[PDB]
Design an enzyme around this catalytic site. Structure first.
Site, PDB file in Angstrom:
ATOM      1  N   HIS A  73      -3.829  -3.346   7.746  1.00 10.96           N
ATOM      2  CA  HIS A  73      -4.741  -3.560   6.605  1.00 10.96           C
ATOM      3  C   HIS A  73      -5.241  -2.256   6.123  1.00 10.96           C
ATOM      4  O   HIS A  73      -5.426  -1.368   6.915  1.00 10.96           O
ATOM      5  CB  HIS A  73      -5.981  -4.385   6.972  1.00 10.96           C
ATOM      6  CG  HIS A  73      -5.685  -5.692   7.598  1.00 10.96           C
ATOM      7  ND1 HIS A  73      -5.081  -6.725   6.910  1.00 10.96           N
ATOM      8  CD2 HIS A  73      -5.952  -6.164   8.844  1.00 10.96           C
ATOM      9  CE1 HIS A  73      -4.936  -7.758   7.724  1.00 10.96           C
ATOM     10  NE2 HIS A  73      -5.466  -7.450   8.896  1.00 10.96           N
ATOM     11  N   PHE A  74      -5.443  -2.142   4.817  1.00 10.62           N
ATOM     12  CA  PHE A  74      -6.127  -0.985   4.180  1.00 10.62           C
ATOM     13  C   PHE A  74      -7.603  -1.330   4.111  1.00 10.62           C
ATOM     14  O   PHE A  74      -7.968  -2.340   3.463  1.00 10.62           O
ATOM     15  CB  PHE A  74      -5.562  -0.716   2.782  1.00 10.62           C
ATOM     16  CG  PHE A  74      -5.984   0.602   2.208  1.00 10.62           C
ATOM     17  CD1 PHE A  74      -5.207   1.727   2.432  1.00 10.62           C
ATOM     18  CD2 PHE A  74      -7.153   0.714   1.461  1.00 10.62           C
ATOM     19  CE1 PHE A  74      -5.596   2.914   1.922  1.00 10.62           C
ATOM     20  CE2 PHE A  74      -7.565   1.925   0.964  1.00 10.62           C
ATOM     21  CZ  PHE A  74      -6.781   3.021   1.211  1.00 10.62           C
ATOM     22  N   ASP A  75      -8.450  -0.624   4.871  1.00  8.73           N
ATOM     23  CA  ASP A  75      -9.881  -1.012   4.960  1.00  8.73           C
ATOM     24  C   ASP A  75     -10.625  -0.416   3.793  1.00  8.73           C
ATOM     25  O   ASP A  75     -11.399  -1.126   3.142  1.00  8.73           O
ATOM     26  CB  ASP A  75     -10.575  -0.616   6.285  1.00  8.73           C
ATOM     27  CG  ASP A  75     -11.783  -1.571   6.702  1.00  8.73           C
ATOM     28  OD1 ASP A  75     -11.609  -2.816   6.831  1.00  8.73           O
ATOM     29  OD2 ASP A  75     -12.919  -1.083   7.008  1.00  8.73           O
ATOM     30  N   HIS A 127       0.757  -1.280   0.000  1.00 11.63           N
ATOM     31  CA  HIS A 127       0.000   0.000   0.000  1.00 11.63           C
ATOM     32  C   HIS A 127       0.767   1.299   0.000  1.00 11.63           C
ATOM     33  O   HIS A 127       0.168   2.350  -0.280  1.00 11.63           O
ATOM     34  CB  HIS A 127      -1.065   0.016   1.098  1.00 11.63           C
ATOM     35  CG  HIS A 127      -1.973  -1.136   1.059  1.00 11.63           C
ATOM     36  ND1 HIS A 127      -2.840  -1.371   0.015  1.00 11.63           N
ATOM     37  CD2 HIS A 127      -2.116  -2.168   1.914  1.00 11.63           C
ATOM     38  CE1 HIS A 127      -3.479  -2.502   0.248  1.00 11.63           C
ATOM     39  NE2 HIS A 127      -3.062  -2.997   1.397  1.00 11.63           N
TER      40      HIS A 127
END
Ligand SMILES: [Hg+2]
Ligand SMILES: [Hg+2]
Length: 118
Positions: free
Chosen positions: A113-115, A12
């Protein structure tokens, strides 16, 4: 093993040789499969890590270890095309400024985490 935090950064962070095709491959997302969707963030690592102490919000999954950024951030959304299939992964590239939502974990408490983005 790669840690959760390391995985987040590789997938990311970025502080039809299109950007998405190129970066998804470089970052080892599409060397061994085609991943349907991935977002990259064009801000400093430290500015993204800073989101872990910003506004606490529910995660899509109901956990409450997610955080939304006060500011919009420069992001690129990569999403597979309809016919894309391994090994010829094909991506649509969409650039936007949006608030990010990340899930945070650990000591130090860092993105894992990228939500979403909004
Ligand atoms: Hg991961
Ligand atoms: Hg990852």
């Amino acid at each position: 093993k790669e840690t959760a935090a390391a995985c987040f950064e590789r997938c990311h962070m970025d502080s039809s040789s299109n950007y998405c095709n190129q970066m998804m491959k470089s970052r080892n997302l599409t060397k061994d499969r085609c991943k349907p969707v991935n977002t990259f963030v064009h801000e400093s690592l430290a500015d993204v890590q800073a989101v872990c102490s910003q506004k606490n919000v529910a995660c899509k999954n109901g956990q409450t270890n997610c955080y939304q950024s006060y500011s919009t951030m420069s992001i690129t959304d990569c999403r597979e095309t309809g016919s894309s299939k391994y090994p010829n992964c094909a991506y649509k590239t969409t650039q936007a400024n949006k608030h990010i939502i990340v899930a945070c974990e650990g000591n130090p408490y860092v993105p894992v985490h990228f939500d979403a983005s909004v």
